[PDB]
Amino acid sequence: VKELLEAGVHFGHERKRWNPKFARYIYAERNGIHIIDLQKTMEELERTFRFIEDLAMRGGTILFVGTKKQAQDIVRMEAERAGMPYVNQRWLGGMLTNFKTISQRVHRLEELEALFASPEIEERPKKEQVRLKHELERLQKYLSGFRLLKRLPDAIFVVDPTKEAIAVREARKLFIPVIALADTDSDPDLVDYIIPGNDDAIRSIQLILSRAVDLIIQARGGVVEPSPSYA
RNA sequence: CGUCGUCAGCUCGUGCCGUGAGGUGUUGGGUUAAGUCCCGCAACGAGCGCAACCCCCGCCGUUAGUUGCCAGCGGUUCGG
Ligand SMILES: [Mg+2]
Ligand SMILES: [Mg+2]
Ligand SMILES: [Mg+2]
Ligand SMILES: [Mg+2]
Ligand SMILES: [Mg+2]
Ligand SMILES: [Mg+2]
Ligand SMILES: [Mg+2]
Ligand SMILES: [Mg+2]
Ligand SMILES: [Mg+2]
């Protein structure tokens, strides 16, 4: 799968502001930052991709979570390529532990989708119209990827567990396995299937997520070639 | 029924934090007469209040013209 292409796009990130528990995946400090051991990256990648393939074979769903400014686009296209749920803008506290209450809002979202169509009604007062259109804009902004979730997922794919500790907490509490891309400032104990790679550069996230979703696509009988690559 | 006080408030469901009383939401920034609205946020929503729905005044239109009124017309003891 990977075959040494990792070095061209990334090796690691982050200086002395590190988590010492990450030391099992670090090789050296050269410019002041930590260089991730790429052989350990490959060894972990084999296990992670094997688990991902086994899960995708059985029909389970993976929730792709990423909200940094370097992943608002990669995550969306990668998760949409598999027809898979994603969170892209902001993790709403309780998106998993309060799944029923939060998913009550997508019912309102879909109800407002069938409200603004031309056939039925346009006789609402204009101020109420603007209220409902504000509500629709917010619901679409925050629940556009969450809509594909009909139940609690079988795994969550997180691009930065330190930044997204609330999602990891919710997943670990509910016994849902968590897969994470993590740099040297991360806690690996909370991550079941780790990939020790750089998660702040665009190309590293692109490569990892794109190839992961290629494996998912393969695990359902098909080969879709092109992915959105953005230099 | 008076009063704080027509003051801008008081709470709830589920989730989360805390051994617990409890907290969060409801804090921060801008705005409003207003917990009014916007942005941000472990919260996501909701209820009672605010506002609106009702009445009077201010402009115009349709239906009508008596016991109302009298622009134009003709009478007139001079009051339609
Ligand atoms: Mg918890
Ligand atoms: Mg008071
Ligand atoms: Mg509560
Ligand atoms: Mg406790
Ligand atoms: Mg209060
Ligand atoms: Mg409070
Ligand atoms: Mg008031
Ligand atoms: Mg209010
Ligand atoms: Mg009122």
Instruction: Provide the experimental method for this PDB entry.
Output: cryo-EM
Boundary residue ending a domain (A147, A170, A187): A147
How many domains is chain A partitioned into structurally? Answer: 2
Distance in Å, CA A178 to ligand 4 centroid: 25
Does nucleic acid strand B have an atom less than 7 angstroms from the CB of A139?
yes
Distances A149 to A18, A96, A103, A106, A139 between C-alpha atoms, Å: 35, 10, 9, 10, 15
Determine the Cα–Cα distance for residues A126 and A123; give it in Å rounded to an integer.
8
Report the DSSP beta bridge partners of residue A195.
Answer: A181
Residues A170 and A65 in one domain: yes
Closest CA to B15 C1' — which residue?
A: A98
A4: left (phi over 0), alpha (psi -120 to 50) or beta: left
Burial annotation A189-214 (CB, 10 A radius, 16+ → b, else e): ebbbbbbbbbbbbeebbbbbbbbbbb
The nucleotide whose C1' lies nearest the CA of A134 is B38
Distance in Å, CA A191 to ligand 9 centroid: 54
The answer to whether A79 and A205 have CB atoms below 8 angstroms apart is no
Task: For residue A206, give the nearest of A10, A3, A54 by alpha carbon.
Answer: A10
Amino acid sitting at position A168? V
Nucleotides of B under 7 A from a protein CB: 13-17, 37-39, 41-45
Breakpoints of chain A, after residues (C–N > 2.5 Å): none
Q: Which domain holds residue A33?
A: 4-91+148-231
Q: How far is the CA of A134 from the C1' of B9 (A)?
A: 26
Residues A16 and A124 in one domain: no
Closest CA to B43 C1' — which residue?
A: A93
The nucleotide whose C1' lies nearest the CA of A142 is B44
Determine the Cα–Cα distance for residues A44 and A3; give it in Å rounded to an integer.
14
Residues A72 and A154 in one domain: yes
